[PDB]
Amino acid sequence: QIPASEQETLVRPKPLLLKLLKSVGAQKDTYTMKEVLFYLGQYIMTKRLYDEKQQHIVYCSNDLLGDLFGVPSFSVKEHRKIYTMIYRNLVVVN
Numbered sequence: 001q002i003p004a005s006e007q008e009t010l011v012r013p014k015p016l017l018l019k020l021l022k023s024v025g026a027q028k029d030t031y032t033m034k035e036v037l038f039y040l041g042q043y044i045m046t047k048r049l050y051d052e053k054q055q056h057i058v059y060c061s062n063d064l065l066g067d068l069f070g071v072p073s074f075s076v077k078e079h080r081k082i083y084t085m086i087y088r089n090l091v092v093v094n
């Protein structure tokens, strides 16, 4: 469905994404998509936004992540949707 190559994509986060990334990882100008997915996953888990028991839904209406993605919640199974929400918060570099 999603190619493995997607995770090699180099990105420059927009300010609000960068702000979220900085609460879980070291700041730098450019990230891989692998890094962005890892750091956002860690952001979600540390802050207990993920309800794994009960439908694999992340609940983010009470959090900055909700502002980033424009949704009150989403399913962690919907990978293409997740990539699209992340993409709108960054600029791809070559």
Ligand SMILES: O=C1N=C[C@H]2[C@@H]1[C@H](c1cccc(Cl)c1F)[C@]1(C(=O)Nc3cc(Cl)ccc31)N2CC1CC1
Pocket: 036, 037, 038, 040, 041, 042, 044, 045, 050, 058, 076, 077, 078, 079, 080, 082, 083
């Ligand atoms: O399938 C999954 N089930 C749980 C994992 C993983 C999911 C995931 C992994 C690769 C690519 C995509 Cl698009 C993907 F969604 C991920 C992840 O590893 N990083 C991340 C980041 C955001 Cl913003 C949302 C969900 C996840 N989840 C973290 C759990 C704390 C919710």
